């Protein structure tokens, strides 16, 4: 019943439309969902999908620990909801 | 227990090395799996995930001479 990725009680639904951060956040909110929390996605198989998409803090999810001065930054995004 | 996409009895596992088609197909075979069938995935929520990864027909999955092209790919296996 999760049309996406399942990890630790949450379903991650991919939105393939590139958006600015605030639009991505708005769109997840419209679906009673949130963007991924970077501390909740720290598993290789999942980051393989979520890398370079919007994190909940306004930064991209990455396998490193910036790159923070990007003009007109648009990214895909996952919306996250507890199962 | 599917660390990837689960759809109607099949588990789709993402492989992230860019590989030529023949290499990708050989990997899925070694994993007792297949590449996605473009007809099985196109009308489904899988399409945004599998787009521009290797289809079982030798082409990147969409919505020419591709023997030198490299793409990521999913290996697909039925779960029982």
């Amino acid at each position, epitope marked *: 019943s999760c049309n996406g990725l399942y990890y630790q009680g949450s379903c991650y639904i991919l939105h393939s439309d590139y958006q600015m951060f605030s639009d991505a956040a708005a769109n997840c909110t419209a679906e009673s969902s949130t963007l991924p929390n970077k501390s909740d996605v720290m598993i290789t198989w999942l980051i393989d999908y979520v*890398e*370079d998409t919007w994190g909940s803090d306004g930064n991209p999810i990455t*396998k*490193t*620990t*910036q*790159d*923070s*001065d*990007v*003009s*007109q930054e*648009v990214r895909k995004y996952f919306c996250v909801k507890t199962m | 227990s599917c660390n990837g996409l689960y759809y109607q009895g099949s588990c789709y596992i993402l*492989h*992230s*090395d*860019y*590989q*030529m088609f023949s*290499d990708a197909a050989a990997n899925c075979t070694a994993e007792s799996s297949t590449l996605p069938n473009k007809s099985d995935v196109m009308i489904t929520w899988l399409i945004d995930y599998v787009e*521009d990864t290797w289809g079982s027909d030798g082409n990147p999955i969409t919505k*020419s*001479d591709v023997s*030198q*092209e*490299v793409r*990521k790919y999913f290996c697909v296996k039925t779960m029982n």
Partner: antibody
Amino acid sequence: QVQLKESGPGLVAPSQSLSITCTVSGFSLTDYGVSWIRQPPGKGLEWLGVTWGGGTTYYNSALKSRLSISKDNSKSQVFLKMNSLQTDDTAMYYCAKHKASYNGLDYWGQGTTLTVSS
Amino acid sequence: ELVLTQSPTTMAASPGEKITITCSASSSISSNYLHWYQQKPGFSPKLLIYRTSNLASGVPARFSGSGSGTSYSLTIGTMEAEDVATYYCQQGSSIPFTFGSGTKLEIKR
């Protein structure tokens, strides 16, 4: 912080072998591809080869018979080896990290200068 | 290989004026796999534009890129003194990965 650093012999005689090491930090070689690229003095960029996270390695066919790439994931090192060196091989040699998708190169080493001469 | 031919080889751009350089591929590329680099003498190339049109970190908004199929371009909205450099396109779709023949931008004064 992502870093790549090339270390090479600087000068090698024609027909001898070449070995260059790319030492990386701030990322794991299991997570990203690394490519080798060279640039002769005053010329353009020539891609040499790539090794991806799982070890998949492809080469430029104009050099494949003469060039090899290997890596040590545990030591965060990528290696470029060349044999039968010719004058044409004189160039700046760079290693560069790939982005997660589409094979753009987001971080480059400062390069190592290599001269083939007696 | 997918040969990328850049035009012009050298360009003298008027200060503060719009300037465009082109990248022509021998085979069609999806726009996601076409990137641009800037290189100044004595320095490594730096990623400038990613996936045809997306500016990299620290790149001024006056830069842009566009294209599809075999025809791509980079535009600087207002040529600045610090924009003098050599620019390379690159494809990451097929082996061997290839860089364009390069365009050196110079500025008038």
